[PDB]
Amino acid sequence: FRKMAFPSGKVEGCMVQVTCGTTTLNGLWLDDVVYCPRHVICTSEDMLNPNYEDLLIRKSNHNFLVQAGNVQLRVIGHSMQNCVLKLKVDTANPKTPKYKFVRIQPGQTFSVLACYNGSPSGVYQCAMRPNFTIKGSFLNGSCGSVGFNIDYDCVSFCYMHHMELPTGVHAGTDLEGNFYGPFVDRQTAQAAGTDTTITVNVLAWLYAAVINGDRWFLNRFTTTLNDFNLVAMKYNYEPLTQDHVDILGPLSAQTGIAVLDMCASLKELLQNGMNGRTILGSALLEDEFTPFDVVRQCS
Amino acid sequence: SGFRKMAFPSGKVEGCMVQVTCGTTTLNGLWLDDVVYCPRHVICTSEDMLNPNYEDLLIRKSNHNFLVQAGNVQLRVIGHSMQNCVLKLKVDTANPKTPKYKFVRIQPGQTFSVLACYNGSPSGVYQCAMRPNFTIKGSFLNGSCGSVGFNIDYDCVSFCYMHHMELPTGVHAGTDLEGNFYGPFVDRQTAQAAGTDTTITVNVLAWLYAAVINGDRWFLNRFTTTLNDFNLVAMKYNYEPLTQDHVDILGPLSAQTGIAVLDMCASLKELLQNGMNGRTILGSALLEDEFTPFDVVRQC
């Protein structure tokens, strides 16, 4: 049981390099539009209190250098949707796949294609933290890297990297320029909230451990939705709703273990620890496998 | 902080995966130029797998017994031969998506990306390391035989692994692209015992050097040790012994930093006896051994 990322082939062909003045970052090429963070029009000195609406009026089409490998794309128009620049180019991307723009909720997972100067270098699977950040691996030059999920033939773009917080975490927007979380695209002290453990994902990961035969945390006890949330709230675990119980349904039939029964096992794992044992090889509880990921990878 | 186990982009490999069917068996194949590589046990039924006579089984097959499918386009098998444990199916049409590629055989401790495929369709990609017992610990369900491992350098894809078997202990075994198994394993359905899996010591040390470069310093100590005393202690925790070749490879890491290799070995010795005590190293609550020195002395 490994954390697998989606194949990145359909997205690799859409990454380009956008240069405005001295700043160079990554852009997404779909049809005849290049999407990229809007702070590419800002100098390092303009990031204090940038007036993007005034900064964009000064610029023209010939200030943007869009490069797709060796070819050069010619910008014929520009526009702004919230926090993303939409550059209209003269040629359509023939590698444009069946795609869709969606906004995800905290706790959901997706794959990230980390790029540098318009060239893909790595891919990895991650989850949106409940504080609206992601524990990614972004260095200088990976701004504009995109996150995606892959329906059978359709690529759902759900994230674009914008900033790196001074903690190791990263923040971004959706493809329509709407930020995930309370952040703004300025160079200032920005605090990421208290991160909580995704409880529904831990339960789905405990069902995967039972499917793989590792069943030692199972006990004869059960608990109530109101008693577990009491213990979950104290250990910084997000509260469990009834819709969470409904999503874990398919995993409850394959194993035969009810949700509130499994909640009594997780409740014992937080209070007493693991008593020096391993679940799926780990000594910690993983929370970056959604219930849908467990059904995808197992059944 | 933050050090993510990153996999290579799989686009160049996705265009080379095909589906190979012989009778009832169906697994994955690798289409490069005019040859399709796939495990030779595709010509085996579930009953032949206990004691397979591959020479007897193959002489009774004809070119039209192999069904090769790249999506919807069915390829035409024009000939076949067997290199060790791999079938080479010559087809009529060359793969136009063939990238600049290479065949390399790796050693234990090295890392590579795996493209897991099911019936010629890629499903996921992950990064892993060849364990000292010549096994890999990944997610391979039934129908993933033929999935390949690779590294990408500039534009050249270096194929180094092809999945063949799953061991009863849950781990997987395979060959290189020339058909030679990694380790003592065979393509029979017999009781095969993997060796004791140990921690890759040189990988942990390179990861600890990256920690002091990225700020984390709480585990350092003032002691040093000899290579022979450290191995006497490392062997107790099922850690691979360190050779002089490992010390030389860590040289540049100990140059950018100030801590000698034998200095870091003393710190690791102290970590093994005390544990983590609730703290983390580069956002990890465990000692990671799947980051090679080459990647650390580059992505520093």
> Which tokens in the block code for residue B88?
């080479």
Which domain, by its residues, includes A82?
Answer: 10-89
Query: What Cα–Cα distance (Å) separates residue A180 from each residue in A35, A102, A133?
Result: 17, 13, 8
Rg over CA atoms, chain B: 22
Query: What Cα–Cα distance (Å) separates residue B3 from each residue in A159, A168, B15, B215, B272?
Result: 20, 9, 30, 13, 21
CB pairs under 8 A, 24+ apart, for B154-158?
B155/B99, B155/B100, B156/B99, B156/B100, B156/B101, B156/B102, B157/B12, B157/B13, B157/B99, B157/B100, B157/B101, B157/B102, B158/B101, B158/B102, B158/B103, B158/B104
Q: Which helix (H) or strand (E) holds A72?
A: strand A71-73
Given the residues A36, A39, A126, A263, the one annotated as active site? A39
Q: List strands edge to edge, sheet with B35-39.
A: B73-75, B66-70, B17-22, B25-32, B35-39, B86-91, B77-83
User: How do the residues of chain A divide into helix, strand and coil, expressed in percent and rounded to 5?
Assistant: 25, 30, 45
> Which tokens in the block code for residue A69?
């490998």
- Nearest alpha-carbon partner for B169 in B211, B205, B133: B133
For residue A123, list chain B residues with Cβ-Cβ distance below 8 A.
6-10, 125
Residue A131 amino acid letter: N
Structure obtained using: X-ray
Q: Which residues of B are catalytic?
A: 41, 145
Minimum CA–CA partner of A14 in chain B: B11
* Given resolution (angstroms): 2.1
Q: How many other CB atoms sit within 10 Å of the CB of residue A276? A: 6
Q: How many other CB atoms sit within 10 Å of the CB of residue A21? A: 14
Contact residues for A79 (Cβ-Cβ < 8 A; gap 6+): A85, A86, A88
Task: Say which CATH number the domain at B279 has.
Answer: 1.10.1840.10
Beta strands, E only, chain B? 17-22, 25-32, 35-39, 66-70, 73-75, 77-83, 86-91, 101-103, 111-118, 121-129, 148-153, 156-166, 172-175
- Nearest alpha-carbon partner for B86 in B174, B152, B197: B174
Residue A151 CB burial class (10 angstroms; 0-12, 13-18, ≥19):
exposed
Q: Report yes or no: B75 and B19 within 8 Å, Cβ to Cβ.
A: no
Does residue A220 sit in helix, strand or coil? coil
- Nearest alpha-carbon partner for A237 in A279, A275, A266: A266
The Cα–Cα gap between A121 and B286 comes to: 26
For residue B138, list chain A residues with Cβ-Cβ distance below 8 A.
2
DSSP code for A7: P
Contact B14 A1 (CB under 8 A): no
The Cα–Cα gap between A64 and A86 comes to: 12
Minimum CA–CA partner of A169 in chain B: B2
Minimum CA–CA partner of B124 in chain A: A6
Query: What Cα–Cα distance (Å) separates residue B54 from each residue in A200, B4, B70, B81, B239?
Result: 49, 43, 26, 12, 39
Nearest Cα of chain A lies from the Cα of B176 at a distance, in angstroms, of 22
Task: Say which CATH number the domain at A62 has.
Answer: 2.40.10.10
Number of H helices, E strands in chain A: 8, 13
The Cα–Cα gap between B28 and A162 comes to: 39
DSSP code for A226: H
CB pairs under 8 A, 24+ apart, for B256-264?
B256/B213, B256/B300, B257/B209, B257/B212, B257/B213, B259/B209, B259/B212, B259/B220, B260/B224, B261/B205, B262/B224, B262/B225, B262/B226, B262/B227, B262/B230, B263/B224, B264/B205, B264/B208, B264/B209
For residue A192, list chain B residues with Cβ-Cβ distance below 8 A.
none
Contact B138 A8 (CB under 8 A): no
Q: How many other CB atoms sit within 10 Å of the CB of residue B249? A: 18
Q: Report yes or no: A195 and A231 within 8 Å, Cβ to Cβ.
A: no
For residue B128, list chain A residues with Cβ-Cβ distance below 8 A.
2
Nearest CB to B5; choose among A113, A124, A284: A124
Query: What Cα–Cα distance (Å) separates residue B167 from each residue in A15, A222, B86, B132, B188?
Result: 40, 36, 19, 16, 11
Q: How many other CB atoms sit within 10 Å of the CB of residue A117? A: 16
Contact B7 A122 (CB under 8 A): yes
Contact B9 A113 (CB under 8 A): yes
Q: Is A298 a catalytic residue?
A: no
Q: What is the largest CA-CA distance in chain A?
A: 70
Cross-strand partners of A5 = B125
> Which tokens in the block code for residue A225?
């939705």
Contact B11 A6 (CB under 8 A): no
Contact residues for B69 (Cβ-Cβ < 8 A; gap 6+): B18, B19, B20, B21, B75, B120
In the stretch 15-34 of chain B, residues with CB closer than 8 A to chain A read 15
Q: What are the DSSP calls for B143-158, one per residue? A: T-TT-EEEEEETTEEE
Nearest CB to B285; choose among A124, A284, A297: A284
Q: Are strands B86-91 and A109-116 parallel, antiparallel or unpaired?
A: unpaired
Q: What is the largest CA-CA distance in chain B?
A: 70
DSSP code for A84: E
The label of the residue with tokens 């980051």 reads B291
- Nearest alpha-carbon partner for A263 in A298, A295, A299, A232: A232
Q: Report yes or no: B186 and B178 within 8 Å, Cβ to Cβ.
A: no
Contact residues for B167 (Cβ-Cβ < 8 A; gap 6+): B135, B173, B185, B192, B194
Contact residues for B255 (Cβ-Cβ < 8 A; gap 6+): none
Nearest Cα of chain A lies from the Cα of B9 at a distance, in angstroms, of 6
Note whether B115 contacts A: Cβ–Cβ < 8 A: yes
For residue A120, list chain B residues with Cβ-Cβ distance below 8 A.
9, 11
